[PDB]
RNA sequence: UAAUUGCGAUAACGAACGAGACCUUAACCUACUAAAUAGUGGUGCUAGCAUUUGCUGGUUAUCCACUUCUUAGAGGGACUAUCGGUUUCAAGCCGAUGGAAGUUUGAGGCAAUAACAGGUCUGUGAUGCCCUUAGACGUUCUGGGCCGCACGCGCGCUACACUGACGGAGCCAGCGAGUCUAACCUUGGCCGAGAGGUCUUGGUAAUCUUGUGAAACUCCGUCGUGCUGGGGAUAGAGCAUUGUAAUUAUUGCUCUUCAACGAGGAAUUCCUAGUAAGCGCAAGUCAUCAGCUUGCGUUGAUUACGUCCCUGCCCUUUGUACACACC
């Protein structure tokens, strides 16, 4: 085969899976390039990882990311985490440790939960209101 | 370099393709256009008046191209929107099916789609051809 | 769209169907202030009459106006789906009309006056000045009359 | 019947709309018997023997 | 305008029956070597900077 | 033939709730002292080597105003 | 609030009292020790016990504690 | 800028303004200081971001709310009056617009101007209801710097909202005016007015 | 109906001879000159942009932004 | 998870306390290529009260 | 301390119920066991665009391989850890660091003793007593009524628009549920503006409906502050669906009619983080009917991290002629 790792990135329920092999420097999401991914107001959220670590570094690898679940924002954050985690996985396996640690160090020194999967999750609603804490309404008499 | 349509930004591709089927003339546009409302969950008829059938056709072409096979109902559920039940809460309700279906047949005659097995419409190889072509075009607009 | 100019060929405010229509308002949304035609009917007719929706009311030519009046008070003839019409099955002659302007009032009157004349519960209900479509009356409308 | 129903006045919105709102239409719960709860109406009471027999 | 700036040096308590006012002792920084206990409004911590607009007047118990 | 039933003795009647509930039910139905019934029941249940036991009795006995009675011996836990 | 229950501190007490010729100021080995010495029906309980007997172990190393 | 490129291409000035200066939407992030003692530590600016959107958590600790990028502290305090409870794309966008407008008029970094609208409208001291038996009086108080920030943003954004109600101009434009006038006090701005009033009262009852 | 709904010739010349000094121009800036409804205002912007004064430094709907030519 | 949501009360009175019961269905399947006897043997025995066994042949 | 939760003082010492433990769920696991009812990589087979290798799809089994994602079994994992502030250097609490996670990890399930004449004889073929039992207060059948309208009150739903309505277009979830002695979930193909009709189909279900292509929301237009194209009440007319039956109009559809409401007095409810609020689903009910509820995910703020002022309740001290216990 070739050198290749696969990773992921989650936000709420949105899971974003990421194939990262060695290639000519593509970066695709679902089936379309990173120059799309609209929202687009949040374009630089997923642009971010390739700018934090210098725009090169990808010119010997190939990335595709498929996203399922979550909403729109959920998926955007999911895939940026997926890509970051991906790159660092690739260097953990194939390059060296000082570089993997240098990329981790360059990420975490800024971050937005890029390698660390945010554990914020929806809370159960209980009987008595239209919410998790929010109770309905009383009038006494 | 080569191209699919996954290389063009939806509204770019679809605007383009719209102006293309427009610039062409071979369409089959039933006739009830401008008098039809596209959806029960809608108020007025389309503001485009002259056009939009091209827009919907292009949208359909594009979308069916992405995936395997898709019938008329999927396009109802897709183009279905928020109905304002006046003083009652919004619910989602499907769009028109004669519009969608007649677009399918009108893009089946003009050769961009085909009644595949499993049911539903499948993107045509000539459709692959032309869609990728105008993709190359629309991209080449911003050379 | 475009930068236009014109001289003195547009008139603000103008009268037709025994009712007045503002001139400095889009044609479609202008001839909606005619009791009988609404945004939909108006739009469809404007489209039919071969007029640009982008024009104001006062912008139009006379010929267009007349044709508009025509098409409106003649739907089924200039091809309009009958189910696009407010008064299908005249409950007497059976033909499909679209009652316009000072007429729709008179037609409300008519139908009501039929109901009451037949002494049906909807007649008795419209005579009593009440909620007539079978709604709860215990809690709603404490002004009205 | 229906005929009376449309003929007979003293009927319809106006005639009610001109009459007056009775004072018992904005009152209170009326209650009647509550602070009495713990005290028995029965006025009979049990008997220590029969209580000592049953339990 | 002789606006004064003084750094929080301690946290004393919560005056007022409501408990929103925070009793806190502060020390000026333009001419140090003197301290005044003052009362804030919002959320404060040690080493913050209060803008005193009243150079000599302090407070205590609130009701 | 699709169905077959087997009558089978249960080991230690004095560790089954249902068996005891039935027990005291038929005690009181045979007209035995309420206290002696519950106490005899708890006694037999305890002597069958149970960790703990209890018998609540709620209703009206010869009186008219209803009452209730707990009879519990040994160790029981209530939560979790 | 992380006020350890009575059963926890009681157990920790007993354990430090009868296994000081073992243990340390390290939670892991105290936990594992606990598993090799005390029959505990719960992981969570055993970690609470081990963590507290660990803290006590640290604070005995610089002086005595009552009990 | 010593350009790199590969398969799926990334636009020029995009590559540029990304790898080079880690600036905002596309505005200068350095320079810009809080033009006042205090307020520093409580007004962010650095470390820099791209768009005021974040998977952040500033509510799980008392003061950690004060380390969030201040611009996002402005954008967040937009999206409300109920019909906008949530909708941060709306907020973020109108914030970009607003920044553009501000920067268009009288130049300057829009972000800097924002700093100058926060610093000013924050009331230096206020008042509170003190009992003393039935007929309460009003005791002045040297309000915290953090609450000076919070109250600054609240005043600014809310005033901008009431000003954008039932009138032709947009939230972006009205907000722009409320940051421009509040760059240096003009008393033709909602915030400066209300702040000055609170100080009028704070000194009147002292 | 309250004025600013059409194109009275010298209104167009007003518009032509007023966009200088406009540090900022948009819909809500066009209207503010006691003139032009939003239709004819959007049209005004889009046409004036064909050649003259206003420099496009922003994008889309709901929010218009321009400056001056240099 | 077969859920059931119910008012705890037999009547209508009281603060509206709901209660949620559930029954949990676990379903496994094992694929075996084998003759006739060993299957019949394995379905005859290994019988469990509560565990429902169903033995299909099939290929379409 | 959330805790009769602990520490400590100490004629008390050492315990047991209850709290805690425990159970359930959301969080972590490139570690184990695996899988055409889950999915990935390669290969066949094949379309499009590039053509220089490539980029983007198709092919319920063409093979081979795998288990990161999905699924559920056994395990591991946190014990407020490490350091340091602060306090009787005690319990603990604060802060930094690390960490899937450090507010009882988040949310629930259970939960002692005692009380109330709280509610339920309109859930029970649970039941004492009383009343009724053939011109019945039994039962069944027809029709009507619980919906009746000068008005008072409570839960709500939709709104007063420009962080907006409209119209194009972009396009994304999680909890569910579905037909045997039956007609339930229904893709797909035609017909119709629509609602819906019709011709077939998969699915007793991780396999089919269904990726439930949901809605707020994103994008490009149109309108331009005017009771306006905001708002959709009232109402006339016509088409359909459920059903033996729809009139007092079950519901759905299309045209027209275009109300009040220009942010709302005194008062008053709910809420501290993926919480509030905004947004739509699914489920219950159900032949037909959600402006209700139970759950669910989507978008995602502001302000505390305090106190005893209003209120509500606990706890000691004290009084008592109460103990059927201030009714």
UniProtKB/Swiss-Prot annotation, chain A:
Record-listed Phosphothreonine modification sites: 68
Chain coiled-coil ranges: none
Disordered as annotated region, ranges: 121-141
Keyword terms, alphabetized: Acetylation, Cytoplasm, Isopeptide bond, Phosphoprotein, Ribonucleoprotein, Ribosomal protein, Ubl conjugation
A Pfam family the protein falls into: Ribosomal_S9
Disulfide bonds: none
GO molecular function terms noted in the UniProt entry: RNA binding; structural constituent of ribosome
A biological process from GO: maturation of SSU-rRNA from tricistronic rRNA transcript (SSU-rRNA, 5.8S rRNA, LSU-rRNA)
Cross-link (Glycyl lysine isopeptide (Lys-Gly) (interchain with G-Cter in ubiquitin)): 28, 45, 57
Record PTM Phosphoserine, positions in chain: 32, 59, 74
Subcellular location: Cytoplasm
Family assignment from sequence similarity: Belongs to the universal ribosomal protein uS9 family.
The protein's role, per its UniProt record: Component of the ribosome, a large ribonucleoprotein complex responsible for the synthesis of proteins in the cell. The small ribosomal subunit (SSU) binds messenger RNAs (mRNAs) and translates the encoded message by selecting cognate aminoacyl-transfer RNA (tRNA) molecules. The large subunit (LSU) contains the ribosomal catalytic site termed the peptidyl transferase center (PTC), which catalyzes the formation of peptide bonds, thereby polymerizing the amino acids delivered by tRNAs into a polypeptide chain.
Summary of subunit composition and partner proteins: Component of the small ribosomal subunit (SSU). Mature yeast ribosomes consist of a small (40S) and a large (60S) subunit. The 40S small subunit contains 1 molecule of ribosomal RNA (18S rRNA) and 33 different proteins (encoded by 57 genes). The large 60S subunit contains 3 rRNA molecules (25S, 5.8S and 5S rRNA) and 46 different proteins (encoded by 81 genes).
Gene it is expressed from: RPS16A
From Swiss-Prot, chain H:
Function: Component of the ribosome, a large ribonucleoprotein complex responsible for the synthesis of proteins in the cell. The small ribosomal subunit (SSU) binds messenger RNAs (mRNAs) and translates the encoded message by selecting cognate aminoacyl-transfer RNA (tRNA) molecules. The large subunit (LSU) contains the ribosomal catalytic site termed the peptidyl transferase center (PTC), which catalyzes the formation of peptide bonds, thereby polymerizing the amino acids delivered by tRNAs into a polypeptide chain.
Any one cellular-component term (Gene Ontology): 90S preribosome
Lineage: Eukaryota, Fungi, Dikarya, Ascomycota, Saccharomycotina
Molecular function via GO: mRNA binding; rRNA binding; structural constituent of ribosome
Entries under Pfam families matching the protein: Ribosomal_S7 (PF00177)
Protein family (similarity comment): Belongs to the universal ribosomal protein uS7 family.
Keyword Ribonucleoprotein among UniProt keywords: yes
Protein modification: N-terminally acetylated by acetyltransferase NatA.
Cross-link type Glycyl lysine isopeptide (Lys-Gly) (interchain with G-Cter in ubiquitin), residue numbers: 26, 184
Cystine connections: none
Compartments, record wording: Cytoplasm
Entry keywords, A to Z: Acetylation, Cytoplasm, Isopeptide bond, Phosphoprotein, Ribonucleoprotein, Ribosomal protein, Ubl conjugation
PROSITE patterns listed in its UniProt record: RIBOSOMAL_S7
GO biological process: cytoplasmic translation; maturation of SSU-rRNA; regulation of translational fidelity; ribosomal small subunit assembly; ribosomal subunit export from nucleus; translation
InterPro entries linked to this entry: Ribosomal_uS7 (IPR000235), Ribosomal_uS7_CS (IPR020606), Ribosomal_uS7_dom (IPR023798), Ribosomal_uS7_dom_sf (IPR036823), Ribosomal_uS7_euk/arc (IPR005716)
Modified residues (Phosphothreonine): 8
From Swiss-Prot, chain I:
Location of this chain's protein in the cell: Cytoplasm
One term of GO molecular function: structural constituent of ribosome
Keyword terms: Cytoplasm, Methylation, Ribonucleoprotein, Ribosomal protein
GO biological process: one example: cytoplasmic translation
Chief location bin: cytoplasm
Source organism superkingdom: Eukaryota
Cytoplasm among keywords: yes
Coiled coil residues, start to end: none
GO cellular component: cytosol; cytosolic small ribosomal subunit
Protein function: Component of the ribosome, a large ribonucleoprotein complex responsible for the synthesis of proteins in the cell. The small ribosomal subunit (SSU) binds messenger RNAs (mRNAs) and translates the encoded message by selecting cognate aminoacyl-transfer RNA (tRNA) molecules. The large subunit (LSU) contains the ribosomal catalytic site termed the peptidyl transferase center (PTC), which catalyzes the formation of peptide bonds, thereby polymerizing the amino acids delivered by tRNAs into a polypeptide chain.
Something else known: It is presumed that the precursor part of S25 is engaged in assembling of the small subunit, thus being essential in ribosome maturation. Present with 322000 molecules/cell in log phase SD medium.
Family recorded in the similarity comment: Belongs to the eukaryotic ribosomal protein eS25 family.
Protein name, as recorded: Small ribosomal subunit protein eS25A
Gene source species: Saccharomyces cerevisiae (strain ATCC 204508 / S288c) (Baker's yeast)
Gene name, Swiss-Prot/TrEMBL: RPS25A
Segment of the intact protein contained: 36 to 105 of 108
UniProtKB/Swiss-Prot annotation, chain J:
Free-text description of this protein's post-translational modifications in UniProt: N-terminally acetylated by acetyltransferase NatA. Also partially acetylated by NatC.
Compartment(s) where it occurs, according to its Swiss-Prot or TrEMBL record: Cytoplasm
Location in chain, cross-link Glycyl lysine isopeptide (Lys-Gly) (interchain with G-Cter in ubiquitin): 40
Biological role: Component of the ribosome, a large ribonucleoprotein complex responsible for the synthesis of proteins in the cell. The small ribosomal subunit (SSU) binds messenger RNAs (mRNAs) and translates the encoded message by selecting cognate aminoacyl-transfer RNA (tRNA) molecules. The large subunit (LSU) contains the ribosomal catalytic site termed the peptidyl transferase center (PTC), which catalyzes the formation of peptide bonds, thereby polymerizing the amino acids delivered by tRNAs into a polypeptide chain.
Subunit structure: Component of the small ribosomal subunit (SSU). Mature yeast ribosomes consist of a small (40S) and a large (60S) subunit. The 40S small subunit contains 1 molecule of ribosomal RNA (18S rRNA) and 33 different proteins (encoded by 57 genes). The large 60S subunit contains 3 rRNA molecules (25S, 5.8S and 5S rRNA) and 46 different proteins (encoded by 81 genes).
Family per similarity comment: Belongs to the universal ribosomal protein uS10 family.
Record's protein name: Small ribosomal subunit protein uS10
Lineage: Eukaryota, Fungi, Dikarya, Ascomycota, Saccharomycotina
Range of the intact protein held here: 62 to 121 of 121
